[PDB]
C-alpha cells in the first residue's frame, strides 16, 4: 500500500521531494514494483538522489521484472559493479539492466579468456567505459589485439589509458599515421624499440591539434589526406 | 528419433542370408532427427466440457502435449479410435 511504500521511502534515505518526484515518474508502475526496484538499486549501494536521477533518465527500469532485476543486480555485484562504481555506469550506459545476461557474460568472457584481463582490470574497464558492453564482440577483440600486438601495449597500460573507450577508426587513423611517419615503432620480440614511443595519452586522449603538433609534428591537411587514404584502404581491404 | 544412413552401400546378402557388415558400414550420416520435425496434432474425442476446446463428443485436434498431459490422463478426453467414434455417434443419435 501507499502507506507502507511511503514509510519505506521515508526510510532508506529518500527525502519527500525525491519521493514525490519518483511517484510522479511512475508510468503506471505499481507502488510495489517501484519499492522493489528502488530497494534493489540501494542494495547495489546506490545513493537515493542518484537513484532518483537514474529513474528520471530511464523510466523503463521501473518496468523490468523484479526477478530479472534481482538476477542482474546479483550479477553486477559479482562483477564488482556496486556502491559508487555503479553510478557513472548507470549514467554513461543506463541500459546495462536491460542488456541480455548472455551479452554481458560473453563480453566479460571475451575480456577474460580471449583477452587475458584480470578480474580487477575487467571491473575497471566496465566502470570507466561501459560502452564496451554495447560494442560487439569480434570488433572488441580486434581493438584489443590491435593494442596488444600491432601497438605493443600491455593490459595495465590499456586499462590505465581506457584505450578500449576510443573508436577503432580513430585508433587506427592516429596509430598508422604515427607508424608510417616513423614516430611510432612496434616493440620487437624483446619488447624494446630504437626510440621510445609516444604515450597513449599523447596519442588518443589529446585533440587533433596537439596530436599533430607535438606527437606527429605534421600539418592538419596532411592528416586529413592520410585519413581519407586510410579510409579507402579499409574499404578496399573489406 | 535419430535416423541415420550408411555412407557406404552394403552389398546385397541374398534371400535367406544375412548381410555381412564391415568397418566401413559402421559409418553413418544423420538423415534426420525426428524431434526437430514440425509438431503435429492429436485427434481426441472429448468427454467433459473443457474451456476453449469443446464440450463433449466433438473430435478435436489438440496439441500432443495438452492431449497427453491434461486431457487423456484426467479422463477429459478419449482417443479418437473407430470404436470411440462409433460409441459417441450412437450417443449423439440417441439425443
Amino acid at each position: 500500500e501507499l502507506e507502507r511504500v511511503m514509510s519505506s521511502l521515508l526510510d532508506m534515505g529518500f527525502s519527500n521531494a525525491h519521493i514525490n518526484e519518483l511517484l510522479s515518474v511512475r508510468r503506471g508502475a505499481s507502488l510495489q514494483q517501484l519499492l522493489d526496484i528502488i530497494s534493489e538499486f540501494i542494495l547495489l549501494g546506490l545513493n537515493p538522489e542518484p537513484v532518483c536521477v537514474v529513474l528520471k533518465k530511464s523510466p523503463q527500469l521501473l518496468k523490468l521484472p523484479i526477478m530479472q532485476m534481482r538476477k542482474r543486480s546479483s550479477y553486477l555485484q559479482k562483477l564488482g559493479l556496486g556502491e559508487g562504481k555503479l553510478k557513472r555506469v548507470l549514467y554513461c550506459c543506463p541500459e546495462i539492466f536491460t542488456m541480455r545476461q548472455q551479452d554481458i557474460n560473453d563480453t566479460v568472457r571475451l575480456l577474460k579468456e580471449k583477452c587475458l584481463f584480470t578480474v580487477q582490470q575487467v571491473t575497471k574497464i566496465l566502470h570507466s567505459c561501459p560502452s564496451v558492453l554495447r560494442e560487439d564482440l569480434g570488433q572488441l577483440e580486434y581493438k584489443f589485439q590491435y593494442a596488444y600486438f600491432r601497438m605493443g601495449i600491455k593490459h595495465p597500460d590499456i586499462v590505465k589509458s581506457e584505450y578500449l573507450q576510443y573508436s577503432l577508426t580513430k585508433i587506427k587513423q592516429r596509430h598508422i599515421y604515427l607508424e608510417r611517419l616513423g614516430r611510432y615503432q612496434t616493440p620487437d620480440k624483446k619488447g624494446q624499440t630504437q626510440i621510445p614511443n609516444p604515450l597513449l595519452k599523447d596519442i588518443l586522449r589529446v585533440s587533433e591539434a596537439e596530436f599533430l603538433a607535438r606527437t606527429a609534428c605534421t600539418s592538419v591537411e596532411e592528416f586529413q589526406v592520410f585519413k581519407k587514404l586510410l579510409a579507402r584502404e579499409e574499404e578496399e581491404s573489406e | 528419433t535419430v535416423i541415420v544412413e550408411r555412407w557406404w552401400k552394403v552389398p546385397l546378402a541374398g534371400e535367406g542370408r544375412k548381410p555381412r557388415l564391415h568397418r566401413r558400414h559402421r559409418v553413418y550420416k544423420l538423415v534426420e532427427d525426428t524431434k526437430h520435425r514440425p509438431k503435429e496434432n492429436l485427434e481426441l474425442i472429448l468427454t467433459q466440457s473443457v474451456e476453449n476446446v469443446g464440450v463433449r463428443g466433438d473430435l478435436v485436434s489438440v496439441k500432443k502435449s495438452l492431449g497427453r498431459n491434461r486431457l487423456l490422463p484426467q479422463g477429459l478426453a478419449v482417443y479418437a479410435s473407430p470404436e470411440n467414434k462409433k460409441l459417441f455417434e450412437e450417443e449423439k443419435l440417441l439425443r
Binding site: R180, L181, G182, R183, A216, C217, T218, E222, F226, R232 | -
Partner: protein, 51 residues
C-alpha cells in the same frame, strides 16, 4: 655444410629490409622531411593521366 649455428639473423622480409635501409640513410639525408617522405612512400601513390 654446418647445419647448426649459434645464432641466425632475424630473417626480415625484403620490404622491411628496404624500410630499415631507408630509415638509416634518408633520415640523415633529409632531417625533418624524412617522416613526411616516409609516410608519403608508405601511403598510396598519386597517379597522373597522360592523354
Amino acid at each position: 655444410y654446418k647445419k647448426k649455428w649459434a645464432a641466425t639473423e632475424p630473417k626480415f622480409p625484403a620490404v622491411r629490409l628496404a624500410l630499415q635501409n631507408f630509415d638509416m640513410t634518408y633520415s640523415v639525408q633529409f632531417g625533418d622531411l624524412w617522416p613526411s617522405i616516409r609516410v608519403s612512400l608508405l601511403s598510396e601513390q598519386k597517379y597522373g593521366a597522360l592523354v
